[PDB]
Amino acid sequence: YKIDGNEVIFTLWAPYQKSVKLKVLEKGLYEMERDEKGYFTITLNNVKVRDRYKYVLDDASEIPDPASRYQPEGVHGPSQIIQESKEFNNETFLKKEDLIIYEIHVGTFTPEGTFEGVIRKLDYLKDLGITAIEIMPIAQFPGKRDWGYDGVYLYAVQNSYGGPEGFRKLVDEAHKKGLGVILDVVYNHVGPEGNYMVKLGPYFSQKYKTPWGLTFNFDDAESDEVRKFILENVEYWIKEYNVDGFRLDAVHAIIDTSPKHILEEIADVVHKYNRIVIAQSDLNDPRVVNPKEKCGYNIDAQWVDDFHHSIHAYLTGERQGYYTDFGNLDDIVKSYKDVFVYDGKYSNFRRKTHGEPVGELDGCNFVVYIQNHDQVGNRGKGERIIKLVDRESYKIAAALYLLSPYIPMIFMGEEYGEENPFYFFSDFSDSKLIQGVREGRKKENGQDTDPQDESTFNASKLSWKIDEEIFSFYKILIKMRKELSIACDRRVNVVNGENWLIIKGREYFSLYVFSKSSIEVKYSGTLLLSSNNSFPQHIEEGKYEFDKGFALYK
Numbered sequence: 001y002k003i004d005g006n007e008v009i010f011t012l013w014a015p016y017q018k019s020v021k022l023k024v025l026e027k028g029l030y031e032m033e034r035d036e037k038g039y040f041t042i043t044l045n046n047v048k049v050r051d052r053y054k055y056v057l058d059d060a061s062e063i064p065d066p067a068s069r070y071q072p073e074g075v076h077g078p079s080q081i082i083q084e085s086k087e088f089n090n091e092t093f094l095k096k097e098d099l100i101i102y103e104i105h106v107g108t109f110t111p112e113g114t115f116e117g118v119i120r121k122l123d124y125l126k127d128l129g130i131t132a133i134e135i136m137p138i139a140q141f142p143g144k145r146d147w148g149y150d151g152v153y154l155y156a157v158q159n160s161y162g163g164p165e166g167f168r169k170l171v172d173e174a175h176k177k178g179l180g181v182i183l184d185v186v187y188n189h190v191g192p193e194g195n196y197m198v199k200l201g202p203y204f205s206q207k208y209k210t211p212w213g214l215t216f217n218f219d220d221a222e223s224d225e226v227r228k229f230i231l232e233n234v235e236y237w238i239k240e241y242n243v244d245g246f247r248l249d250a251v252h253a254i255i256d257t258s259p260k261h262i263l264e265e266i267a268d269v270v271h272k273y274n275r276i277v278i279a280q281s282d283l284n285d286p287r288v289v290n291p292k293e294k295c296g297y298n299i300d301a302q303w304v305d306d307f308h309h310s311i312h313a314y315l316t317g318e319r320q321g322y323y324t325d326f327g328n329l330d331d332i333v334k335s336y337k338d339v340f341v342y343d344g345k346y347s348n349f350r351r352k353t354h355g356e357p358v359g360e361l362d363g364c365n366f367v368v369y370i371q372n373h374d375q376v377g378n379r380g381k382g383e384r385i386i387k388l389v390d391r392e393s394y395k396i397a398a399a400l401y402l403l404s405p406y407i408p409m410i411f412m413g414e415e416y417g418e419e420n421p422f423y424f425f426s427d428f429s430d431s432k433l434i435q436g437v438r439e440g441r442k443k444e445n446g447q448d449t450d451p452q453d454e455s456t457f458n459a460s461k462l463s464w465k466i467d468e469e470i471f472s473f474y475k476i477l478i479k480m481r482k483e484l485s486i487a488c489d490r491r492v493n494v495v496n497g498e499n500w501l502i503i504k505g506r507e508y509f510s511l512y513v514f515s516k517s518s519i520e521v522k523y524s525g526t527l528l529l530s531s532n533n534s535f536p537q538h539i540e541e542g543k544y545e546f547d548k549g550f551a552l553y554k
């Protein structure tokens with residue numbers, strides 16, 4: 001819908017439909033006029049915020065507005081008219097070279113499980129050194145318990161998180177504290193419950209499908225309208241909620257053979273309104289991130305799993321699934337200097353040559369992490385890395401990524417040493433999908449906890465039990481990164497022995513000692529931070545026997 005003067009225009013694209021009627025609940029039924037493209041319209045003057053409505057098809061069946069702005073009674077309920085105050089800055093104050101990102105799942109972040117709960121934690125975040133919070137998908141999904149990827153109304157803010165009013169309040173309060181908010185958005189697929197688009201028109205591609213459902217139709221018959229549906233959604237989040245940027249989910253599963261890729265158009269919209277796009281890419285292909293004059297889509301940055309996988313595989317000893325492609329120290333050094341480990345070499349996991357070198361692109365085109373919702377939650381027992389490595393290793397892992405040239409992303413709780421698992425949970429009502437989720441998560445991930453069980457969700461809620469030694473470590477790590485101008489700068493010299501490595505930057509050098517060993521140090525410097533007490537306040541060029549641990553020098 002779109003509120004005009006005192007009247008409001010209802011627009012519904014439904015080419016499969018002969019005639020649709022608007023059903024305002026406390027008022028009457030209204031016949032909609034049809035144009036040749038398949039668009040249904042009526043201007044109504046009696047409608048006010050916040051009335052409920054549905055659409056009634058040729059079927060006589062009643063469905064919610066697929067472009068709904070609020071879904072008060074969940075996915076199968078009516079839609080609701082909200083206020084459309086388009087207050088937005090023309091500029092985000094976020095500078096992407098200064099980006100430290102904190103990933104939040106609203107539902108489990110705090111006892112509240114709401115936007116109000118993340119608001120309460122803003123000062124804490126600000127004080128930690130974070131510059132931006134990344135919110136997992138908030139587009140309305142079934143029930144109350146879901147990561148967000150089963151979202152099924154792109155324009156509707158999850159009711160159980162606190163809806164539109166609560167999200168607007170979150171972003172306003174974040175700006176007041178000087179924090180940015182990045183929104184996780186899903187344009188590659190749609191959730192398996194509460195989607196009614198398939199009855200309206202060819203929203204989905206017949207060409208291929210994702211592991212999580214059918215993909216959107218971007219390059220085939222009638223795709224103009226669906227391109228518009230997605231592109232106006234990124235416009236909507238910017239103008240109606242004043243969001244600072246986006247994390248685009250699974251861009252490798254957004255397939256488009258058009259002259260201009262939809263991903264380039266997505267980035268075009270966000271840069272038109274001076275915002276930021278990060279992409280989750282499995283492609284290891286610099287085209288996602290390259291400038292337009294270099295045949296790229298010009299996304300600001302992309303997740304580099306290769307960085308995480310190098311660290312995890314090496315420190316845990318783990319080789320199951322995608323970890324089989326990693327495990328050596330070499331991999332960490334490779335990722336530290338060439339970004340991708342798979343830059344056009346053969347992957348045993350994928351059984352094909354994978355990737356492409358990244359060129360002279362600086363570090364702030366990439367985001368790295370040792371933990372996130374996937375690397376924790378797709379484990380059958382959902383164990384955080386804190387459970388798989390010793391204390392020393394954990395701090396070594398934290399130092400590696402936070403002191404890297406790339407944009408670092410902290411996973412909620414990681415910073416204070418959270419020990420609670422993060423499980424996969426869902427809240428479907430359809431018995432077939434309740435059947436499929438359990439058996440699928442059992443088979444694919446080895447998950448023994450029931451995703452549909454409430455306890456699986458409750459067990460994933462952060463404890464907020466502060467380990468002060470870990471927290472102080474992160475706090476200083478973040479501080480020193482800013483102070484040492486580590487951001488974006490790929491000019492690093494890395495040396496490695498069997499059980500250790502030294503990384504030297506322009507203003508610092510770091511010692512990463514994985515086992516007691518004798519190391520030749522080529523640099524002088526004063527101690528900034530350390531995982532131990534075993535490290536000297538002042539070090540000079542020479543040979544030293546170090547115990548397991550990390551040290552940072554100026």
Ligand SMILES: OC[C@H]1O[C@H](O[C@H]2O[C@H](CO)[C@@H](O[C@H]3O[C@H](CO)[C@@H](O[C@H]4O[C@H](CO)[C@@H](O[C@H]5O[C@H](CO)[C@@H](O)[C@H](O)[C@H]5O)[C@H](O)[C@H]4O)[C@H](O)[C@H]3O)[C@H](O)[C@H]2O)[C@H](O)[C@@H](O)[C@@H]1O
Binds near residue numbers: 149213280282373436
């Ligand atoms: O191949 C090497 C890489 O492998 C991984 O990456 C892939 O999988 C990731 C995790 O699934 C993807 O990440 C993102 O995309 C998905 C989907 O949006 C999302 O996945 C989560 O949510 C879905 C949807 O609920 C869930 O799907 C299952 O359950 C539903 C409900 O029953 C069912 O319909 C599906 O059939 C089930 O499969 C997933 O289980 C859950 O993981 C994820 O959260 C997003 O971040 C990547 O895009 C994709 O490449 C690995 O993550 C990489 O690190 C490896 O490099």
